[PDB]
Amino acid sequence: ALKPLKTWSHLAGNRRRPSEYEVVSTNLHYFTDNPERPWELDSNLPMQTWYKKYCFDSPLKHDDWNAFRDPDQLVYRTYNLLQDGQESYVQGLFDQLNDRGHDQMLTREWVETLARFYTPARYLFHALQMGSVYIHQIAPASTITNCATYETADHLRWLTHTAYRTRELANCYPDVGFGKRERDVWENDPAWQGFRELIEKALIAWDWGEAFTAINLVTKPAVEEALLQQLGSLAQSEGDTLLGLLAQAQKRDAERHRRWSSALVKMALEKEGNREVLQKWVAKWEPLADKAIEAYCSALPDGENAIVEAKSASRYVRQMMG
Amino acid sequence: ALKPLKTWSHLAGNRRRPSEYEVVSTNLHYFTDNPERPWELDSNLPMQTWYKKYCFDSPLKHDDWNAFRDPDQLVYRTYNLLQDGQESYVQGLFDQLNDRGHDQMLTREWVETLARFYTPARYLFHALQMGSVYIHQIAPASTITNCATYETADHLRWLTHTAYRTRELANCYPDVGFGKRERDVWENDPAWQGFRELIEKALIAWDWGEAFTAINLVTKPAVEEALLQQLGSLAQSEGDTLLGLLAQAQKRDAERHRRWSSALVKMALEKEGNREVLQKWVAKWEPLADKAIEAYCSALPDGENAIVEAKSASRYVRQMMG
Amino acid sequence: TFPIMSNFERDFVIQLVPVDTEDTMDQVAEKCAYHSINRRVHPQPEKILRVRRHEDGTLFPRGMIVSDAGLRPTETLDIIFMD
Amino acid sequence: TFPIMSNFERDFVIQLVPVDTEDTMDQVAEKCAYHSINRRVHPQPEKILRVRRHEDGTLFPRGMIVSDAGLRPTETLDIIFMD
């Protein structure tokens, strides 16, 4: 008869005692059990074809994607403990900066810059949310999926901060159009068209490997450097201590996404040919990111400098991954 | 035989169902059961005499001090939930403002103002801690004691914020003397002598009623307006966003202390003669508070104005209590 | 070997029962009874076990063989007690 | 009425036992036995109950009365079984 183990049978002989993270996250997807018929139905259904083409047939390869491990080892339980603390901080900032009338002290010029450059990001942030939730459903391992899961929740977090602040700004400056105009700015303003073209096209890159690359490796670093880093620094220098601190807080989530993305690339580089596959996707998408950064930052004060810094910092993210 | 009740027998027939707050806080002191021998020992012991003289014989009177109710209804459980949230905010400020090198951006002049006006408050804050913990042990009702209990914890909270920041400042400006010099400033600097004389004398007002008045009604409002309000506003205008936000956060605890202090005075005014007793103690102590505010604020930039504002705001606290 | 699904009278479930193409309905019923009689269905010594196509109810002669029954593989058959 | 503390032999606790100043040691012992004998101490028909000052062990004559014993109020007395 079979004797009981001290851990899950798939983790047996793991050497060291399995952590809570490994216990709850590993080897959970079952659609990868039968590559020729992932789902328990007719093998010709559209979804069968979708996973075979965009998951199984991807040019990013490994023999054991399930070996991937999130460097932050995020679990649901710890994700909520972490973010509940971070939200207590952000909520406190909102509450107390409101108490001292922070918004009433902004210059008219800065308020107009916010209407153009800031509020409309609720569209870009939600697009990132959709972008990462797609990675969630097409990745080949549960440990990879979870990272995308929490990343998606973070994107919704930014969207939410943005929605909240848009309301406060509208209340303080009802004539600016905060809350009403964002869609028209996102759709029409030349400052946003680079980012809009980039994310719209990236949202239809179905291959899990290309989605990971287009979203995580190319688009997010460009959005983060432009909207959080550059706009955030500008905010501070313009007297908007709130946006300056908010952007820095959201950057913490972005740093975490870069950490797991970096670990996945590191694992992919264990196999010959993946470096080239990834660099090929980066060369395809990078030009749209440059375009996004250029159109957005050039419209900001001292744009030429902001552009160089954003281009430099975003590229550095990938350079340090090899 | 005695039939079981639906609540504590001392709360029976309370009309409305007793709250968690009333359930855990009311009618807990037993030394008030026998005014002639509060403690279960010889009636002539020094502590018997101490409570008979400073608790029972106080000129602040009521027939039922146990009827007092904290307006915030603070319990241990809820106190920790509340402050854990507020500390997550303050800790986040410390952590993230440090990340962006906030301290390195202060002007040399402001750094020197901090060494004089800010760090040494660890002595004044601890003295407040000692001041409120004494009120805790000599008050005639447990509901009054608890308010002093949580207030004492808040004073230790301010001391702690101050100790932490003093270290950070010393690390950033090791030549200023942060952490070493505070005692000499507190003891010798004319700017602190008003407050020092005020708190030292108030710390030996043993009568529970006079202690409550000297500490809560007169000293704290003067310290809060000078060190939190005035110094805090100055900090903001001088580029120290951290101290500006920290002082505002600590002011929230101060507002809460004023709320229960206001409720106790309101209850005391139900009895004839207490208004006069309280106004008599206020007239005795108020002159030392004016002196404290004058010596401290006059040394700050635009001191004359700071003095008028602090005097005005602190007096308003008592005026609104009648 | 020919597979058929056995729906034995008074039983609660239809079962897979492999038979032979040369088997007689009586021999088919014998192979089916193996998985039902004395397992969850009581014997009926008096009665005789008969086989009928489940879909349309066609009754097959005791002596007819599987090979001439014009069954579809996996065809469901009712095994009933008769006189 | 005169109070004394009764430390009854073989019992486990000293008890408050009010006696009368005119009582005899034998009558004192009788009042003490009430709170010990047949409650947590077995009777000893053969023996005789005697009273002695607990502090110094002074044995009092069966016929001596409380009033002449020179007891202090609340004095502890041992009630012992003797021949």
Place this chain on the structure above:
Amino acid sequence: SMLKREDWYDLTRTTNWTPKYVTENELFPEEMSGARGISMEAWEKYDEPYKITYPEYVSIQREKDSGAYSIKAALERDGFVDRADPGWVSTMQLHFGAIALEEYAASTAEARMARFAKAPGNRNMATFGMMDENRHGQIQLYFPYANVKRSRKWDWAHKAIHTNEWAAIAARSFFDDMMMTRDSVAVSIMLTFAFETGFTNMQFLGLAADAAEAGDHTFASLISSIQTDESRHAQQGGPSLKILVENGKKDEAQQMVDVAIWRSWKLFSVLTGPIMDYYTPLESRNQSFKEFMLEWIVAQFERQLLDLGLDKPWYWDQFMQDLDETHHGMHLGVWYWRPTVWWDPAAGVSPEEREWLEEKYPGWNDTWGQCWDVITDNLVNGKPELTVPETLPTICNMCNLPIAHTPGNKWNVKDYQLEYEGRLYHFGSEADRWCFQIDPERYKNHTNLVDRFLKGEIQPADLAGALMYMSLEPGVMGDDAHDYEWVKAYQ
């Protein structure tokens, strides 16, 4: 100060825009979106009734886990699982093996809506739903993991769905059909409305009740806590259904509801029915599986369908009658074929239990009791070899469950066969065959356990071989829960 939620909530869901660099059809492919010709503007009428924002979510969910994990740690060294009733133990092992990884898979079904739904409010609620199922999958691995050293059966909390054991195939058949291979809108309807709102939301309530009654406070708190997350995301189907009805798609909506409710019912008849009427100790039975279904499931569906402007499915009457039988057959099937499952089925046919069964189901002893009579006599007369099978039962090509029904004096076992393109399919009911006929291409070349056995895919081609094919080995293979203790009541 802080804003009230109602003042800014809508901005969190004002996220649709008009694509320019790609087409709307490329961005929201029909096979994934299921917008069904209904415009983006019309889908924007979607309005979830139970609203929640990010900060509220992490705060509230943080406290839920603090509580559940605290209960677990406080009762862990008490070893309740070592003295719990065998029927209860088997109930949990069955629960975890069937559910754990399907809960996790549900996070992908939610993710399907989070990306592809054209209704903004649907995309955000699905993001929270995605997080909820992530929690459900993780916590339902974490809790049973505490018992891996007690029995290999607990390892199936992870393993089950990775095997070809018949029950697991039935589970994937249902879940993959309902939530993994359907467009966004179909998922909100079939999963969220039909299965979660209609079945599990109330069931978990009863499960948590039974756990408490059994003295298992750890499991009681677990299920109880998970249950509270359900409403938050189970709400998603309603609004979708109203949108489809408001426009010209009521029949399409009705057909999805009909299918999903039937498939959910069949899975339920095997995973819950047997447990309520047989595994739970007689003294701890509040009501019968049938009573539970009527009071808590059937009434609610009629209520819901009425309010949405939908009808009762065509099979409603048959469904009503089947409440008397179906689960009794699934229980008998599972117990008889016990060695084919990863938990120990409890016979539940002692004299006391049989009289209860007769009360709740008049005619049980004349029908179902008959089979159990033969089984008992054999056990009494030392013929246990006749209480285990020597062949495979006929499997339904839709629900992948055994085709079973009323036996004994009211014998009524039927097979709704269907010949399609040269192949003969078997169905355990009229509705099961119907599910196949309204969309044959979706099921066509799928093969159930029997089909595979007959095709030669199971080798060696015998029971021992079928057992290895299902990853079953001594130690996990099931047997009678109380070790035939109940037989003594008959000698």
Place this chain on the structure above:
Amino acid sequence: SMLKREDWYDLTRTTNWTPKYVTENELFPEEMSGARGISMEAWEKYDEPYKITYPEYVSIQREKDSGAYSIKAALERDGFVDRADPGWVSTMQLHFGAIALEEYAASTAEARMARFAKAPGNRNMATFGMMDENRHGQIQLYFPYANVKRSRKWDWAHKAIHTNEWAAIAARSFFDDMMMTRDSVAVSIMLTFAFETGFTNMQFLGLAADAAEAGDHTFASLISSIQTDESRHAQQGGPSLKILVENGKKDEAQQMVDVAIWRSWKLFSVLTGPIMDYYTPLESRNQSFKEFMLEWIVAQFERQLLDLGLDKPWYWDQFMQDLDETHHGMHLGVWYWRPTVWWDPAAGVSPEEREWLEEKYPGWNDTWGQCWDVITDNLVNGKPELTVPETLPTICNMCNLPIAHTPGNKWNVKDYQLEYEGRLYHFGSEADRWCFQIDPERYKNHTNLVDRFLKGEIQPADLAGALMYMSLEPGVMGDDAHDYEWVKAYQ
């Protein structure tokens, strides 16, 4: 980034200053400070071993309550208290009535140190200690409050310390002497070192163990959680003792330790001893009260006193022998006078229990068993009127507990009387009388229950009158826990 605690901790305790507007003696009055001639600079050497800062405190304590209150709410409707053993129920009612408000009073003892200690580190740790006891008092009201509808006895969790019931007088006698009427330094020694470190820290561990063993997970989690707060503030005495020894005050330190340990022991002999050897079901007894004391209390004290450079108290040998008897007398006293307490004392003298007692205490049946023999015969022969008293027991003027000791074949009951200024005092032991003689003015005119009865303060002057004086009425007045069930074993 964030600083490490060690980098800034000291600044939180660099708070002493040289008073100028008042004198040092006015600011720190000797009767409240107890600096004892030792300078402020010398007290500054005080260095608490278990450090903690405000933010760490609220975070950690927040989680402790979340856990404890979560366990309570999850098990509340299970009604364990309604089916728990009577001895266990009585154990909790005794616990809550004696402790709840004394825990709260301890927050004032801590506050005494927070204000008046000259050692800065002592003042901050006492502020956290003040908060800990605030928690202990509140949570120990909150938990029993859940049972007020079950019996009036639960109301004594609040009431007890407000009455003149003898047990409560004994409690206040101890607590007021140790922590409420002593200078700051004396409190750190007598309360923090002697009582909390020496007794309760380990006891609560055993109590929580017994609760778990009894199946009371709510109470188990409660006590277990409270216990973890203990070390944090129980540490305060050590450093104070080292300071007194380093300077010229070792004898003063030794005398405080001797007194506090003895008084703590006497309270313990009545509140814990009886419970361990009689109320807890025989099958759930890990060790005897004596074994517990030796393994967990006595050894630790010797260890501690050695490391501090102190001696074993002069009464150590007697204390060792008394472990065989004292509690047996307190138990017999409490059971016999059962109607004078607010809980139901469990006799614990069934045949099985008596053989266990003989094992753990050779000679028990020849001594203690004798009294219980008479009691049993009377109960068997229908003479229950002889198992309740008709007078008051002699009370010790120090511990305010009955003066009782070895009965039967080794009769050794003694009274250490003392005449002081015209009054005759009674003491239950040599050390109790000693506590009085080293400081007569502290106890002199205090009167125990008997003194009051004899002075005419209890009217009417009879038992019914004494009962009303103690606020005891039918419903709360104690009786045999198992309702004399154990008598049947003797016919």
